[PDB]
Amino acid sequence: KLPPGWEKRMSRSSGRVYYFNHITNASQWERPSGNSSSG
């Protein structure tokens, strides 16, 4: 189950989706290992 204070958030206003650390302020699309490469 992924790290505390992170969520998925939309791209372009209307496109796809980024993945954001909310408590730090860090924008990416990619997983910090608490959910892995496949699971």
């Binding site: 791209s11 372009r12 496109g15 796809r16 980024y18 924008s27 699309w29």
Partner: peptide, 10 residues
């Protein structure tokens, strides 16, 4: 870039 997916924001 301009149509923003934010991974490379410049």
């Amino acid at each position: 870039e301009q149509p923003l997916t934010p991974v490379t924001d410049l």
